[PDB]
Amino acid sequence: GRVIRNQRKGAGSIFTSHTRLRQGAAKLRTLDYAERHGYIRGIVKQIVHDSGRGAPLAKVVFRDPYKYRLREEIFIANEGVHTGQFIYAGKKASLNVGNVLPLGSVPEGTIVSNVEEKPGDRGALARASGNYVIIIGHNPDENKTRVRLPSGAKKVISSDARGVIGVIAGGGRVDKPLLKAGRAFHKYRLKRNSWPKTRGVAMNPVDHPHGGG
Amino acid sequence: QYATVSKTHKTVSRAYGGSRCANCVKERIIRAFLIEEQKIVKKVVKEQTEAAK
Amino acid sequence: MRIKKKNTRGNARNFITRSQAVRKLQVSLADFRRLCIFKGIYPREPRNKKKANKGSTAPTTFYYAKDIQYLMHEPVLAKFREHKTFA
Amino acid sequence: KKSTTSWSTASVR
Amino acid sequence: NPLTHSTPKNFGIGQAVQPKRNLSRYVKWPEYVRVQRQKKILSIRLKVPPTIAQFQYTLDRNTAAETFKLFNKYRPETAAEKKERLTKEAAAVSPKPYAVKYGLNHVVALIENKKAKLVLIANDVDPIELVVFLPALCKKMGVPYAIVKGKARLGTLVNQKTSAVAALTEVRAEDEAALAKLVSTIDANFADKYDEVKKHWGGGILGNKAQAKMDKRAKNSDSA
RNA sequence: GAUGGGGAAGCUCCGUUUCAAAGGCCUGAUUUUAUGCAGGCCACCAUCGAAAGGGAAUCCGGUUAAGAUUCCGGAACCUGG
RNA sequence: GCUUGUGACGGCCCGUGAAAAUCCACAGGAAGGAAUAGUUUUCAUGCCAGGUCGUACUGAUAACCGCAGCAGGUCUCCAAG
RNA sequence: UUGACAUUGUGAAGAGACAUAGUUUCUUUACUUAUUCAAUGAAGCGGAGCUGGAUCCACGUUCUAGCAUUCAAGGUCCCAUUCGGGGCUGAUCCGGGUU
Ligand SMILES: [Mg+2]
Ligand SMILES: [Mg+2]
Ligand SMILES: [Mg+2]
Ligand SMILES: [Mg+2]
Ligand SMILES: [Mg+2]
Ligand SMILES: [Mg+2]
Ligand SMILES: [Mg+2]
Ligand SMILES: [Mg+2]
Ligand SMILES: [Mg+2]
Ligand SMILES: [Mg+2]
């Protein structure tokens, strides 16, 4: 039989992401000596829109601890973070919205975002707009933290994994009807070639197993 | 074209003349002085608190 | 013709510093000084030291690049290399 | 006069 | 001096730029350096069978110095002075020479024929199978042997870069007493002293962090 | 799309900064051991890809069978030294 | 009034609408520099040089493609009453 | 998808076989050295401080869109004082593991 679109998408080709207008990959800082032992202060210089992403991003400038220069990082903006705000990242950072802390240093019920799955991977969980991770509890003997993910799942991760206090900005985006194939067109033009979609039943049996009749 | 003109056309006679404007320069001067004074105050207060503690 | 790069022609090519001369000769500083004394190579003063040293005012000993290039062909340098191998 | 090899001297000061 | 002031630097976290420090522990070395260091570490870590581990017991400094002092008097003839002998023999047309015997096959044959009075075996031979059988052969043939450190040292003994083995077969009358005393000294210091310990397995050593963790666990288990 | 590497019997394939010892600069009479180079500093990757994207700087008058912001006359400008 | 350039604005997005070569400036002050003599080629004037390749013409009911000097096809600028 | 074999190593405890001297077999529990995954600027890892404060900490950084770079100033031993140059410290020690 003919190769279906689901199988065709694996070769790449015309199904790759449209990434010309992106601001850069959104990551935390590299887990270094300063964040492992104390804290480090950066400054929010601007909050910008990223093409293909619902949530805004924040440019945060830190000082290089080993060289006289500045380092720019792209964080995912939590709600309430403003330009000119000071952000503190490390084990000794305070419990304020926008700060980056290890999961073992926050109490139960804390709401975090851009949470590391493993210590040092620079953010993996609760990154989309309006989402967050809830700190359910701690297991100090195994140095573990139990958290609740946006999907409702319960996970156990390292207490050295880092997370940003607060909830990802831009929530409530999907509550507005698009009303228009044109608005869907402009939505997916900045993401990838997955729109419009043709139903398998409407195809021939050669094109799709659902075809025929 | 900036390589063809004199330094008068590309600067003004002030600190950060060119790269920064007058109001921003004034604000950073004020911030520098006030924060340095506050640092001296905080160091004196911390030394007194260490002595009393 | 495309636009040329600055600090490549004029004083910058006419004069060469002592460290650059030693590096090009691939000898030690003592060997370089002895070779200069043997061949009568003497330091020179550019009229525009900032042009010759890319805007630096630091004190520097300059030589003629042609003089160093002529010094590259001296057999006493090969004799020095042979003595090093013998040692 | 002319060079036969890549490295020459020709002895002109 | 009123013009000079004390301005200490804060090198803490979130403070002034860190100063230069010796980062030799964190150097990303070339791959050959890393390979040789990890190879030596692995040889230390793994449990070594006794036939290989016996080569880590060598002569001590004093006995090695005495042995090489004896052998340097019988250091073999060089190519420069051999031509001086050939011209002298041509004019006549030479006494019996005494020299250190070397070469692996030659020395093994001398040991098998019981002609070698003393054998010196280098410890750092790669591949090791070239000499791993030599102590047992010397023991079976009743030939006194000693493991010494440095095939380069044996090479300097026999006018080579390296030498896997050296052997003293015949000696002069002025040195027979010294040779007998050296044989007795090697018997006391190397054969009898290391007789039991060479039958054991080697390389039972952990790493630094592993040893620290094991010590901490043992201390915690013994005492709260 | 090469190199360092790694696949493949192989024609060749992956990958594009990694998994590499991938290269430049400053100082020196280094307390002299006597004719052997010592002390330091900064660091990331070839090349190709637009005569509509980016980009140093020129205009007027005249001239030919057919050239023309290019020739001629006059008047400018840029780049490098 | 027409065409066009431009300025301050306003509306729109679950769309917020390139990169790099290159140039300038700032912060810093390693340093260098005058008394009978120095400094400043980011002020003016004066001197020298600018290589290689393209450049005619058509661009269409006859100069391109459609077996043709084929009512077909083929991107764009200017534009009077 | 499931099972076997090879890669495949090192200990402790409990049960077996030479008939109550340690040569092997089976479970449980450990270890790292093969192998596997990830990151970096292979920069701060592990252990200890007759180091200090109160088993834990660095009391070197949290009102502020400032600034932080020239082997680091200072302190202390020398030099042959002369434009300055060296040593210890500032900035604890040790490791045969970049994390
Ligand atoms: Mg149909
Ligand atoms: Mg390829
Ligand atoms: Mg190109
Ligand atoms: Mg163009
Ligand atoms: Mg014409
Ligand atoms: Mg002309
Ligand atoms: Mg024309
Ligand atoms: Mg035409
Ligand atoms: Mg045609
Ligand atoms: Mg045709």
Curated annotation (Swiss-Prot), chain A:
Subcellular location: Cytoplasm
Molecular functions (GO terms): RNA binding; rRNA binding; structural constituent of ribosome
A GO cellular-component term linked to this record: cytosol
GO biological process: cytoplasmic translation; maintenance of translational fidelity; ribosomal large subunit biogenesis
Keywords from the UniProt entry: Cytoplasm, Isopeptide bond, Phosphoprotein, Ribonucleoprotein, Ribosomal protein, RNA-binding, rRNA-binding, Ubl conjugation
Location in chain, cross-link Glycyl lysine isopeptide (Lys-Gly) (interchain with G-Cter in ubiquitin): 45, 92, 118, 144
Top-level taxon of origin: Eukaryota
Modified residues (Phosphoserine): 51, 94, 158-159
Assembly with partners or alone: Component of the large ribosomal subunit (LSU). Mature yeast ribosomes consist of a small (40S) and a large (60S) subunit. The 40S small subunit contains 1 molecule of ribosomal RNA (18S rRNA) and 33 different proteins (encoded by 57 genes). The large 60S subunit contains 3 rRNA molecules (25S, 5.8S and 5S rRNA) and 46 different proteins (encoded by 81 genes).
Family the UniProt entry places it in: Belongs to the universal ribosomal protein uL2 family.
Leftover remarks: There are 2 genes for uL2 in yeast.
Protein name: Large ribosomal subunit protein uL2A
Organism: Saccharomyces cerevisiae (strain ATCC 204508 / S288c) (Baker's yeast)
Gene: RPL2A
UniProtKB/Swiss-Prot annotation, chain B:
GO biological-process terms attached to the record: cytoplasmic translation; ribosome biogenesis
A GO cellular component entry from the record: cytosolic large ribosomal subunit
Main location: cytoplasm
Keyword Metal-binding (UniProt): no
Superkingdom, natural source: Eukaryota
Entry annotated with the keyword Hydrolase: no
Keyword line: Cytoplasm, Ribonucleoprotein, Ribosomal protein
Molecular function terms from GO: structural constituent of ribosome
Subcellular location: Cytoplasm
Record family assignment: Belongs to the eukaryotic ribosomal protein eL34 family.
Other remarks in the entry: Present with 23600 molecules/cell in log phase SD medium.
Record note on quaternary structure: Component of the large ribosomal subunit (LSU). Mature yeast ribosomes consist of a small (40S) and a large (60S) subunit. The 40S small subunit contains 1 molecule of ribosomal RNA (18S rRNA) and 33 different proteins (encoded by 57 genes). The large 60S subunit contains 3 rRNA molecules (25S, 5.8S and 5S rRNA) and 46 different proteins (encoded by 81 genes).
Function in brief: Component of the ribosome, a large ribonucleoprotein complex responsible for the synthesis of proteins in the cell. The small ribosomal subunit (SSU) binds messenger RNAs (mRNAs) and translates the encoded message by selecting cognate aminoacyl-transfer RNA (tRNA) molecules. The large subunit (LSU) contains the ribosomal catalytic site termed the peptidyl transferase center (PTC), which catalyzes the formation of peptide bonds, thereby polymerizing the amino acids delivered by tRNAs into a polypeptide chain.
Protein name: Large ribosomal subunit protein eL34A
Shown stretch of the complete protein: 61 to 113 of 121
From Swiss-Prot, chain C:
Subcellular location: Nucleus, Nucleolus; Nucleus, Nucleoplasm
Residues of the full protein shown: 1 to 87 of 605
Function comment: Component of the NOP7 complex, which is required for maturation of the 25S and 5.8S ribosomal RNAs and formation of the 60S ribosome.
Protein name: Pescadillo homolog
Additional free-text comment from the UniProt record: Present with 4530 molecules/cell in log phase SD medium.
Family of this protein: Belongs to the pescadillo family.
Record's signal peptide: none
Subunit and partners: Component of the NOP7 complex, composed of ERB1, NOP7 and YTM1. The complex is held together by ERB1, which interacts with NOP7 via its N-terminal domain and with YTM1 via a high-affinity interaction between the seven-bladed beta-propeller domains of the 2 proteins. The NOP7 complex associates with the 66S pre-ribosome. Also interacts with NOG1. May also associate with the origin recognition complex (ORC complex).
Originating gene: NOP7
Record's note on what induces expression: Expression is down-regulated prior to the diauxic shift.
Record note on disruption phenotype: Essential gene. Reduced assembly of 60S ribosomes and accumulation of halfmer polyribosomes.
Curated annotation (Swiss-Prot), chain E:
InterPro entries: eL8/uL1-like, Ribosomal_eL30-like_sf, Ribosomal_eL8-like_CS, Ribosomal_eL8/eL30/eS12/Gad45, Ribosomal_eL8/Nhp2, Ribosomal_eL8_euk
Function: Component of the ribosome, a large ribonucleoprotein complex responsible for the synthesis of proteins in the cell. The small ribosomal subunit (SSU) binds messenger RNAs (mRNAs) and translates the encoded message by selecting cognate aminoacyl-transfer RNA (tRNA) molecules. The large subunit (LSU) contains the ribosomal catalytic site termed the peptidyl transferase center (PTC), which catalyzes the formation of peptide bonds, thereby polymerizing the amino acids delivered by tRNAs into a polypeptide chain.
Note: Present with 238000 molecules/cell in log phase SD medium. There are 2 genes for eL8 in yeast.
GO annotation (BP), single: maturation of LSU-rRNA
Location (main, coarse): cytoplasm
Subcellular location: Cytoplasm
Pfam families: Ribosomal_L7Ae
Molecular functions per Gene Ontology: RNA binding; structural constituent of ribosome
GO cellular component: cytosol; cytosolic large ribosomal subunit
Quaternary organization: Component of the large ribosomal subunit (LSU). Mature yeast ribosomes consist of a small (40S) and a large (60S) subunit. The 40S small subunit contains 1 molecule of ribosomal RNA (18S rRNA) and 33 different proteins (encoded by 57 genes). The large 60S subunit contains 3 rRNA molecules (25S, 5.8S and 5S rRNA) and 46 different proteins (encoded by 81 genes).
Transmembrane segment boundaries: none
Disulphides: none
